[PDB]
Ligand binder design. Structure first.
Ligand SMILES: CC1=C[C@H](O)OC1=O
Length: 265
């Protein structure tokens, strides 16, 4: 209820097929603006900002509550409950792909389908597991985020976008710079702490894992790992371009994959 307002919840479009757009680290719901008109004809679209988004009042951020991704799942569920939507497809980027996986396990009745973009179950390497990151690597990043947040944000943006698409760099920079630096580091620590490998078989929803040709946070082998471990019917749909933010850098191509993934659920 207060959440509806606090997280800037908007419902646009129309249809018996409800879809939730749940954005990732460093953006807010506006990151979906380019793909949104491809879904508005056929679906009722629910959009919201994560409590850590720069567009949400940062004094809402309770540092103890959001120690864990469960608390973000709480909000998502409270949002859906407030709207009396008893079933939906969910599209999650980055940290929201993790949020959607947890939410779909807590409420399988609610999530008829997942679509996972820039998704990983764990970023740290492990004996037989290639996450893409070692402990020293992340720690260097946490240390830069505190030392000089704006320099870190300026160096991270182009790498997240991956392809040379200056409009996407600038737009990802604007939301990145809009995050309160202490919140931003907090979320980044939470995410890099998270390990969903064990609960992947608990997801019952069909799922589409969207793979780009390169992702600074998601090595090539992670998608085939998700496909082999998610417990519902899972496919990996491929974009012919690179980057961690395709909804900013290749929105037309992403819109193709979204229309197809959201056809039947
Ligand atoms: C992928 C990644 C490296 C960056 O500096 O922070 C991150 O989340």
């Amino acid at each position: 209820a207060k959440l509806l307002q606090i997280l800037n919840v908007r419902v646009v479009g129309s249809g018996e097929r409800v879809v939730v757009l749940s954005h990732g680290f460093g953006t807010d719901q506006s990151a979906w603006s380019r793909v949104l008109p491809y879904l508005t004809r056929d679906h009722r679209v629910v959009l919201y900002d994560l409590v850590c988004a720069g567009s949400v009042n940062p004094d809402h951020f309770d540092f103890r509550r959001y120690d864990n991704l469960d608390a973000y799942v709480d909000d998502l569920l409270a949002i859906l409950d407030a709207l009396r939507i008893p079933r939906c497809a969910f599209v999650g980027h980055s940290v929201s792909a993790m949020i959607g996986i947890l939410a779909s396990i807590r409420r399988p009745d609610l999530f008829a389908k997942l679509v996972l973009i820039g998704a990983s179950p764990r970023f740290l390497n492990d004996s037989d597991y290639h996450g893409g990151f070692e402990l020293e690597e992340i720690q260097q990043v946490f240390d830069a985020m505190g030392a000089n947040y704006s320099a870190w944000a300026t160096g991270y943006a182009p790498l997240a976008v991956g392809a040379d698409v200056p409009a996407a760099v600038q737009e990802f920079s604007r939301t990145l710079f809009n995050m309160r630096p202490d919140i931003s580091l907090h979320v980044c620590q939470t995410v890099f702490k998270t390990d969903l490998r064990g609960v992947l078989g608990m997801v019952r929803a069909p799922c589409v894992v969207v793979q780009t040709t390169r992702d600074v946070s998601v090595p090539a082998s992670v998608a085939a790992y998700l496909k082999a471990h998610l417990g519902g019917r899972t496919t990996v749909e491929f974009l012919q371009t690179e980057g961690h933010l395709p909804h900013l850098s290749a929105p037309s191509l992403l819109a193709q994959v979204l229309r197809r993934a959201l056809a039947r659920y």
